[PDB]
Curated annotation (Swiss-Prot), chains A, B:
Domain of life assignment: Eukaryota
Lineage, opening ranks: Eukaryota, Metazoa, Chordata, Craniata, Vertebrata
Family as reported in the entry's similarity comment: Belongs to the globin family.
Entry keyword Metal-binding: yes
Residues that, per the record, bind heme b: 73, 105
Protein known as: Globin
Organism encoding this protein: Lampetra fluviatilis (European river lamprey)
């Protein structure tokens, strides 16, 4: 269950390893993985489309995927998660960046804090649906991405 | 000849239109474009290779191109030049971003500034060889990338 508030027990050594195993295949193809994930989240959540100005005009899966702006945006969203997994052994480091990234969303991108957990699930489902460990990493990211609000 | 110091005359309207016409084709396939340019720079400029710590172990086009790191790095570079062509009508914003990038290069990445113009040339020969207009933009960017040095 991915949350964006409250507390989440630390990540066991066992969980971390699994996460790295599942994420590797996905990331090795981040250009595609990021897109498909972002686009699905987009299309499946109409209420959160007004927060992607550079996407305006496009609404169908076909369009989105051919858009360079949709691609560049997907690649950054995905790498932000990669940086997270590659830093599960440093909570102080992970939190600082995500607190920074939280600031941009709240202060600059002005995105609704309620869609982070939604996109996160669209990531957990693709990376390893059902993994309590991965949903735990997400809960950590979502909690951080709301720290600025 | 691209330069990285002093100054250069503003880009005329004609030059801006020429630049945006030659750029579109290249940026359209940026995931591929960037990677081609980067590898061409890297492989052809030995001394500058030590400045790419994450490519530790790769020195051939084949190994490079098939790397997530090399591409992510290339995608970010090519996209910074894109922001630049996108801001030809607002040199202020262009400079703000480029100055920030300059600081990152001189502080975190510890990169020798002599190479900005060389990588810029690789981009010039790829987008529009010989075009004085584009060369000027590259000069503008390099002068800006060295401002924090
Ligand atoms: C899984 C959680 C998310 C992560 C890890 C994430 C990560 C990122 C990253 C790395 C950037 C790059 C910012 C930069 O270049 O400085 C970004 C940009 C952006 N994100 Fe998120 N994001 C997430 C969820 C969301 C959600 C739910 C929305 C929509 C409500 C959203 C909307 C945006 C917007 C508007 C931009 C700016 C695009 C631009 O103007 O270039 N993000 N995000
Ligand atoms: C046209 C010239 C150049 C542009 C526009 C450019 C742009 C960029 C951008 C946008 C980043 C992303 C930083 C971030 O993620 O916040 C970056 C990182 C980096 N650049 Fe450059 N760059 C240029 C030339 C060079 C040159 C000549 C070298 C090598 C001598 C170089 C070495 C690096 C390194 C080592 C990093 C850090 C990579 C990492 O650890 O992720 N760059 N550059």
């Amino acid at each position: 269950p991915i949350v964006d508030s409250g507390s989440v027990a630390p990540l066991s050594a066992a969980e971390k390893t699994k996460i790295r195993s599942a994420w590797a295949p996905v990331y090795s193809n981040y250009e595609t993985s990021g897109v498909d994930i972002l686009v699905k989240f987009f299309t499946s959540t109409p209420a959160a489309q007004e927060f992607f100005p550079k996407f305006k005009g496009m609404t169908s899966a076909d369009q989105l995927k051919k858009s360079a702006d949709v691609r560049w945006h997907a690649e950054r969203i995905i790498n932000a998660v990669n940086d997270a997994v590659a830093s599960m052994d440093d909570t102080e480091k992970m939190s600082m960046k995500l607190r920074d990234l939280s600031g941009k969303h709240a202060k600059s991108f002005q995105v609704d804090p309620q869609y982070f957990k939604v996109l996160a699930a669209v990531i957990a489902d693709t990376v390893a649906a059902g993994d309590a460990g991965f949903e735990k990493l997400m809960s950590m990211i979502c909690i951080l991405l709301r720290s600025a609000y």
